[PDB]
Design an enzyme around this catalytic site. Structure first.
Site, PDB file in Angstrom:
ATOM      1  N   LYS A   1      23.178 100.423  45.341  1.00  0.00           N
ATOM      2  CA  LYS A   1      23.466  99.859  46.773  1.00  0.00           C
ATOM      3  C   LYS A   1      23.974  98.302  45.884  1.00  0.00           C
ATOM      4  CE  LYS A   1      22.146 102.332  49.885  1.00  0.00           C
ATOM      5  NZ  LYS A   1      20.999 103.009  49.270  1.00  0.00           N
TER       6      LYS A   1
ATOM      7  N   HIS B   1      18.086  99.008  50.156  1.00  0.00           N
ATOM      8  CA  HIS B   1      19.042  97.968  50.313  1.00  0.00           C
ATOM      9  C   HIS B   1      18.786  96.472  50.497  1.00  0.00           C
ATOM     10  CE1 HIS B   1      22.327  99.738  52.699  1.00  0.00           C
ATOM     11  NE2 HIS B   1      21.280 101.006  53.017  1.00  0.00           N
TER      12      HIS B   1
ATOM     13  N   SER C   1      18.684 100.642  57.083  1.00  0.00           N
ATOM     14  CA  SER C   1      20.135 100.172  56.851  1.00  0.00           C
ATOM     15  C   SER C   1      21.020  99.439  58.713  1.00  0.00           C
ATOM     16  CB  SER C   1      20.682 100.859  56.522  1.00  0.00           C
ATOM     17  OG  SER C   1      20.212 102.511  57.289  1.00  0.00           O
TER      18      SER C   1
HETATM   19  C1  LIG Z   1      30.258 110.148  70.149  1.00  0.00           C
HETATM   20  C2  LIG Z   1      30.801 110.676  68.635  1.00  0.00           C
HETATM   21  C3  LIG Z   1      29.981 110.205  67.959  1.00  0.00           C
HETATM   22  C4  LIG Z   1      30.391 110.386  66.794  1.00  0.00           C
HETATM   23  C5  LIG Z   1      29.685 110.772  65.678  1.00  0.00           C
HETATM   24  C6  LIG Z   1      29.101 111.195  64.121  1.00  0.00           C
HETATM   25  C7  LIG Z   1      28.825 110.711  62.626  1.00  0.00           C
HETATM   26  O1  LIG Z   1      28.227 109.137  62.798  1.00  0.00           O
HETATM   27  C8  LIG Z   1      29.122 111.129  61.718  1.00  0.00           C
HETATM   28  C9  LIG Z   1      28.795 110.265  60.627  1.00  0.00           C
HETATM   29  C10 LIG Z   1      29.585 110.561  58.888  1.00  0.00           C
HETATM   30  C11 LIG Z   1      28.404 110.239  58.193  1.00  0.00           C
HETATM   31  C12 LIG Z   1      27.368 109.874  57.815  1.00  0.00           C
HETATM   32  C13 LIG Z   1      26.617 109.280  56.883  1.00  0.00           C
HETATM   33  C14 LIG Z   1      25.408 108.197  56.813  1.00  0.00           C
HETATM   34  C15 LIG Z   1      24.159 107.781  56.136  1.00  0.00           C
HETATM   35  C16 LIG Z   1      23.347 107.129  56.289  1.00  0.00           C
HETATM   36  C17 LIG Z   1      22.838 106.140  55.097  1.00  0.00           C
HETATM   37  O2  LIG Z   1      22.011 105.333  55.474  1.00  0.00           O
HETATM   38  C18 LIG Z   1      22.763 106.427  53.952  1.00  0.00           C
HETATM   39  O3  LIG Z   1      21.785 107.267  53.713  1.00  0.00           O
HETATM   40  C19 LIG Z   1      22.893 104.928  52.880  1.00  0.00           C
HETATM   41  C20 LIG Z   1      24.064 104.987  51.839  1.00  0.00           C
HETATM   42  O4  LIG Z   1      23.996 106.535  51.563  1.00  0.00           O
HETATM   43  N1  LIG Z   1      21.864 105.406  51.939  1.00  0.00           N
HETATM   44  C21 LIG Z   1      20.558 105.345  50.779  1.00  0.00           C
HETATM   45  C22 LIG Z   1      20.203 105.013  50.860  1.00  0.00           C
HETATM   46  C23 LIG Z   1      19.320 106.094  49.888  1.00  0.00           C
HETATM   47  C24 LIG Z   1      20.204 107.410  48.885  1.00  0.00           C
HETATM   48  O5  LIG Z   1      21.092 106.287  48.273  1.00  0.00           O
HETATM   49  P1  LIG Z   1      21.894 107.276  46.936  1.00  0.00           P
HETATM   50  O6  LIG Z   1      20.189 108.022  46.081  1.00  0.00           O
HETATM   51  O7  LIG Z   1      21.831 106.170  45.964  1.00  0.00           O
HETATM   52  O8  LIG Z   1      22.863 107.917  47.434  1.00  0.00           O
HETATM   53  C25 LIG Z   1      17.761 106.844  49.892  1.00  0.00           C
HETATM   54  N2  LIG Z   1      16.934 106.140  50.386  1.00  0.00           N
HETATM   55  C26 LIG Z   1      17.626 104.487  51.292  1.00  0.00           C
HETATM   56  C27 LIG Z   1      16.812 104.126  51.798  1.00  0.00           C
HETATM   57  C28 LIG Z   1      18.886 103.962  51.292  1.00  0.00           C
HETATM   58  O9  LIG Z   1      18.621 103.261  51.789  1.00  0.00           O
HETATM   59  C29 LIG Z   1      22.342 103.900  53.124  1.00  0.00           C
HETATM   60  O10 LIG Z   1      21.269 102.834  53.389  1.00  0.00           O
HETATM   61  O11 LIG Z   1      23.814 103.352  54.161  1.00  0.00           O
END
Ligand SMILES: CCCCCCC(=O)CCCCCC/C=C/C[C@@H](O)[C@H](O)[C@](CO)(NCc1c(COP(=O)(O)O)cnc(C)c1O)C(=O)O
Lengths: 143, 423, 49, 492
Positions: free
Chosen positions: D327, D295, D267
């Site tokens: 997704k 994804h 991702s």
């Molecule tokens: C200098 C200051 C910096 C501050 C930054 C701080 C910051 O970034 C905080 C972030 C807040 C929220 C973070 C969210 C993280 C998301 C990660 C993302 O990869 C997700 O894991 C996703 C979407 O949820 N994953 C989906 C996914 C799953 C789970 O899917 P569901 O069961 O339907 O929820 C399982 N396996 C895989 C491979 C994925 O991708 C995503 O990929 O977007």
């Protein structure tokens, strides 16, 4: 654990060298301070800062998902997951020796500066030894 | 070191095990039950119409028309999918409203919503506990608590079920171990993890003694009320409302909304200090899609129905008492649980040598009961992974929509069937 | 006129040196230290030449 | 390892000056964080952060202070970018509830205004199945009326329904594998089905940039975990050779099993896994493969079967085929597909099947309708235009971003497009400036990315028309001119 790899990233070495150079320039900026004392202060401040940021402050600023492996470990032991010799560790051990040589060059080889500079170099150097890993003298900063 | 040719030979001769071992045991769990239509009261199972005594639907809010209408309105407004995590444009206004409603219902500062009933506690436990900490957990904690404890590499010290003297002894020994080394004791955190109403045994924990022990030996309390969230207390606020303990004395209360509220998801409620941390350190929260708005609206309407009419808890209590008193007296089964428990267990008195034969006997009883139009189920466990394996048992679950005559007839049917089989 | 260009340049300075995120008094502290350093460096450099 | 179509990707190196300035900014922020902590320590400035209730002051402090350092100083300053509430269907255009803060992001108050018409680059909906109208919604409504919302017991006891059986059979036909199984949540799918397969005494070779769920699943089981470089087939081959030759660490005994965890599309980085080489290595060294297609289940492939169709391979080669419905198909849930024996064993021994509630009925009906639409069984050409439009959209968007001069990661076919910011303050600056110009985007930092590479993610979709992409590209161009984000040295 990203903190382990931060010293392996791009541009970190050049940033460190530029930081030392800027520190020396700012020390030069003070009007009344004479040159050998400028060099001595540069060396002492650099060694004290390196000691504080490497061997005293322990743990990770960010939370870690391995449930606190590095809870009791300082940054130096944290680097490269405990691998004793690497490019970054070799460079970090090398640089203060070069700084001390240069400082003793520009301080005309007097004793009063030599004793302080040697003490500072020894203080920064002793923790670097692979034999001295995971040990605290007299049990200070153990927890 | 090794020659290259030796490396080729070693790589060539290696033969791995199969990915999954063969299953020759005629495993009963391989034969699932097929439910036709909704799993409600008066359902159909395996092609037979039956009265439902197995689904964890205590208040009968699964088929309440107002809940369905609220869910339909939310469906027509938002859709089905949330399309993101709670951090990345996945938060809706229904999510915030539901969190607010839960917080105001539990008389608590802040609550947090998880999209899966297991993940809520399995990710709440390792958020606050790290390596080196000590956790005193009850022996008969459910599987979710066990996986959560295994996730955090802390030290685990089980204690005997509802034995407070035993926890006191363990805490005294830990006090000695702190006396030896003060430096470590300054950094070690102590937790006590308990369940409000145990799923495996159907008994209730002694909260006042736990609070006294917490304030004496300085150990933070975690409470899991999966079964007691919507059944215990006059206002149905949990076990804290039942015993009279102030809600502040408990640091974290976790409960899944699948059982009582009849919608998917879980939640954790507590003071803001402890709750705000999970939004960043909760693995089930950060890295997973949010709960669909449909289920959130269903939960909100369930909360409104629960708050409006609080007599449903009284009628549930009287029904639980009646069935518990009726089931006493069977030939060869023992009842395990307390009068006020919605779901309890029936176990064998005289146990044959093997466990699989006990399971087969219980399945015989269940089948011959289901052929008389009472639908019962058997508790299912993982034999290899369970830390403390409970004995096999038939699960009996009580619900508000079941009438009095249905409870009497269920008791008579079970008694006659068991006296036929065991004898 | 030149004001727009200077405003853009100051924006870039804040963005690069991370002063963007800081509260207003923190920016004042940092700017005061920086200008003090530059002033002492300039004076010590020029007095000798 | 035969690549029937050319495999192009680009990961440009960070310029030296940008890295140096990144370190300068991070250092300044750290120093001012230390100063703020010191000021708060002597009670000079009252702390907005909640404190312990009075009669629990004797207990050992719940949190170590240094652990929250990054949260307290780095994260809190730009918190307004994340957790934005929305009040509409997350389509191409979304409605955001506008909020403001008077105490520098510690507390938020919702003003009356709702920002309407925000172009939605954040939500996934790759095939554009997130709508509040259509045949999918009507089918879901009918099943909601008939079945009710939610089920109240686990699959093994009474929670198994006829809808779940229909869904499992349909997924089995869709992927091409013999059998499949469905779970409530994808994170749960990974973290509850990894421990069932491998146990103590097995080796898990995991990618460097694997999702958090896969890492958690590997840690729950007792298997030894080793990490190889991201898509470095030489590193993977070296690890496999060493693992087979030397054996278990303490007592040099042969491994029971070797399992390789890979993802279809990463991702964050946006790169597609080099599947043909991975399958060749798996065949040569007798390992097993676990492919996480979260994804790439809908986006990739001429007919959207997944990455395996994209490379034109054979689905029977992959031993375990995981996937997620969130997704693409527009509903929550997960699945695992494979041979029949594996699925029987999982149905018997999976943690989720025993201790977790089944999947909701309206959700499974939405999944069934979406899958039937994609498979061409609806009777209409709406399942084909989606894939064609998504491919063209990704091509146009990636090419235009590369022509303007940004740094773009990933494969040239990957729908997820990460753009590089590289500096801490520029993250918040980009987020705020973009939303100000009526486009919503997502930016990420340490909990998902390394220190130097702080990026912004665009998730393309078939819902985006050409005019939407044109306006968004023009606004990105103007912001890049404003914030000086055009770092690329080759083409500008
Ligand atoms: C200098 C200051 C910096 C501050 C930054 C701080 C910051 O970034 C905080 C972030 C807040 C929220 C973070 C969210 C993280 C998301 C990660 C993302 O990869 C997700 O894991 C996703 C979407 O949820 N994953 C989906 C996914 C799953 C789970 O899917 P569901 O069961 O339907 O929820 C399982 N396996 C895989 C491979 C994925 O991708 C995503 O990929 O977007």
């Amino acid at each position: 654990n990203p903190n382990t790899r931060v010293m392996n990233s791009r541009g970190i070495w050049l940033s460190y060298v530029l930081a030392i150079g800027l520190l020396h320039i700012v020390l030069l900026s003070i009007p009344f301070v004479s040159v050998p004392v400028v060099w001595t202060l540069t060396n002492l401040i650099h060694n004290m800062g390196m000691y504080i940021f490497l061997h005293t402050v322990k743990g990770t600023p960010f939370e870690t998902p391995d449930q606190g492996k590095a809870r009791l470990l300082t940054h130096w032991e944290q680097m490269d997951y405990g691998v004793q010799f690497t490019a970054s560790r070799k460079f970090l051990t090398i640089t203060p020796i070069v700084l001390y040589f240069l400082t003793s060059f520009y301080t005309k080889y007097d004793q009063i500066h030599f004793v302080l500079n040697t003490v500072s170099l020894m203080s920064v150097l002793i923790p670097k030894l692979p034999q001295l890993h995971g040990v605290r003298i007299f049990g200070i900063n153990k927890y | 070191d090794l020659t290259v040719k030796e490396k080729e030979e070693l790589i060539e001769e290696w033969q791995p095990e199969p990915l999954v071992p063969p299953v020759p045991k005629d495993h009963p769990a391989l034969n699932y039950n097929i439910v036709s239509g909704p799993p409600s009261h008066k359902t159909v199972v395996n092609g037979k119409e039956c009265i439902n005594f197995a689904s964890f639907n205590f208040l009968g809010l699964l088929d309440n028309p107002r809940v369905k209408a609220a869910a339909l309105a939310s469906l027509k407004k938002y859709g089905v999918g949330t399309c993101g995590p709670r951090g990345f444009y996945g938060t809706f206004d229904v999510h915030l409203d539901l969190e607010d409603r839960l917080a105001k219902f539990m008389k608590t500062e802040e609550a947090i919503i998880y999209s899966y009933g297991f993940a809520t506690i399995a990710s709440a436990i390792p958020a606050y506990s790290k390596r080196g900490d000590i956790v005193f957990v009850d022996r008969a904690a459910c599987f979710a608590i066990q996986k959560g404890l295994q996730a955090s590499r802390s030290d685990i010290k089980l204690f005997k079920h509802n034995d407070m003297a035993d926890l006191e002894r363990l805490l005294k020994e830990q006090e000695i171990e702190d006396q030896k080394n003060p430096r470590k004791a300054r950094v070690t955190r102590r937790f006590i993890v308990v369940e409000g109403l145990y799923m495996n045994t159907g008994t209730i924990c002694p909260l006042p003694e736990l609070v006294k022990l917490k304030y004496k030996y300085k150990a933070r309390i975690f409470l899991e009320e999966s079964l007691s969230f919507g059944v215990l207390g006059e206002h149905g606020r949990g076990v804290t409302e039942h015993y009279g303990i102030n809600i502040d004395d408990i640091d974290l209360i976790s409960a899944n909304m699948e059982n009582a509220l009849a919608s998917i998801g879980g939640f954790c409620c507590g003071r803001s200090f402890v709750i705000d941390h999970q939004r960043l350190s909760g693995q089930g929260y950060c890295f997973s899609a949010s709960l669909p708005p449909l289920l959130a609206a269903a939960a909100i309407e369930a909360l409104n129905i629960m708050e409006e009419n609080p007599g449903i808890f009284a009628v549930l209590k009287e029904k639980c008492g009646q069935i518990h008193k009726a089931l006493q007296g069977i030939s060869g089964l023992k009842v395990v649980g307390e009068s006020l428990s919605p779901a309890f267990h029936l176990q064998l008195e005289e146990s044959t040598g093997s466990r699989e034969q006990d399971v087969r006997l219980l399945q015989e009883i269940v089948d011959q009961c289901m052929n008389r139009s009472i639908a019962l189920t058997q508790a299912r466990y993982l034999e290899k992974e369970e830390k403390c394996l409970p004995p096999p048992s038939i699960r009996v679950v009580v619900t508000v929509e079941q009438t009095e005559e249905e409870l009497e007839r269920a008791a008579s049917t079970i008694k006659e069937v068991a006296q036929a089989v065991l004898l | 006129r030149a004001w727009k260009q200077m405003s853009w340049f100051y924006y870039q300075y804040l963005l690069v040196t991370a002063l963007y995120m800081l509260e207003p008094w923190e920016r004042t502290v940092f700017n005061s230290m920086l200008v003090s350093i530059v002033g002492m460096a300039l004076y010590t450099g020029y007095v000798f030449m | 390892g035969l690549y029937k179509r050319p495999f192009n990707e680009a990961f440009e190196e960070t310029p030296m000056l940008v890295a140096v300035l990144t370190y300068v900014g991070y250092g300044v922020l750290t120093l001012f964080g230390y100063l703020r902590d010191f000021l708060r320590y002597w009670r000079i400035e009252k702390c907005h952060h909640a404190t312990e209730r009075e009669e629990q002051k004797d207990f050992v402090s719940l949190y170590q202070d240094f652990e929250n350092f990054y949260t307290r100083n780095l994260y809190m300053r730009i918190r307004d970018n994340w957790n934005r509430p929305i009040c509409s269907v997350p389509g191409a255009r979304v409605d955001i509830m506008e909020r403001q803060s008077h105490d520098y992001n510690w507390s938020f108050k919702y003003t009356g205004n709702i920002i309407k018409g925000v172009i939605n680059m954040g939500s996934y909906n790759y095939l554009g199945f997130a709508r509040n109208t259509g045949s999918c919604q009507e089918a879901a409504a009918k099943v909601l009326e008939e079945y009710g919302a939610g089920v109240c017991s686990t699959r093994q006891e009474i929670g198994n329904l006829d809808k779940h059986e229909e869904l499992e059979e349909l997924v089995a036909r869709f992927l091409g594998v013999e059998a499949a199984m469905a779970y409530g949540m994808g994170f749960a799918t990974n973290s509850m089905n990894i421990p069932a397969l491998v146990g103590k005494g097995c080796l898990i070779l995991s990618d460097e940039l694997n999702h958090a769920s896969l890492v958690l699943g590997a840690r729950l089981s007792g298997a030894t975990i080793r990490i190889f470089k991201h898509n470095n087939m030489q590193s993977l081959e070296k690890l496999l050779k060493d693992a087979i030759v030397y054996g278990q660490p303490r007592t040099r005994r042969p491994w029971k099993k070797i399992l390789i965890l890979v993802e279809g599309i990463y991702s964050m980085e946006g790169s597609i896994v080099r599947l043909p080489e991975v399958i060749a290595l798996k065949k040569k060294y007798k390992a097993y493969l676990y492919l996480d297609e979260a994804h790439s289940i809908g986006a990739l492939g001429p007919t959207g079967r997944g990455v395996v169709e994209y490379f034109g391979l054979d689905p029977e080669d992959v031993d375990v085929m995981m996937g997620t419905f969130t997704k693409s198909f527009g509903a929550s849930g997960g699945y695992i597909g494979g041979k029949k024996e594996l699925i029987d064993y999982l149905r018997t021994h999976s943690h989720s099947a025993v201790y977790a509630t089944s999947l909701s009925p309206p959700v499974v009906e939405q999944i069934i309708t979406s899958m039937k639409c994609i498979m061409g069984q609806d009777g209409t050409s709406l399942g084909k235009e989606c894939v064609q439009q998504l491919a063209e959209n990704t091509r146009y968007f990636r090419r235009r971003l590369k022509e303007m001069g940004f740094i773009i990661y990933g494969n040239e076919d990957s729908p997820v497009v990460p753009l590089m910011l590289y500096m801490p303050a520029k993250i918040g600056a980009f987020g705020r400036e973009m939303l100000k110009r009526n486009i919503g985007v997502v930016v990420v930092g340490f909990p998902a990315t390394p220190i130097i590479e702080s990026r912004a993610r665009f998730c393309l979709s078939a819902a985006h028309t050409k005019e939407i992409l044109d306006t968004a590209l023009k606004e990105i161009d103007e912001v890049g001119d404003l914030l000086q984000l055009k770092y690329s040295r080759h083409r500008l």
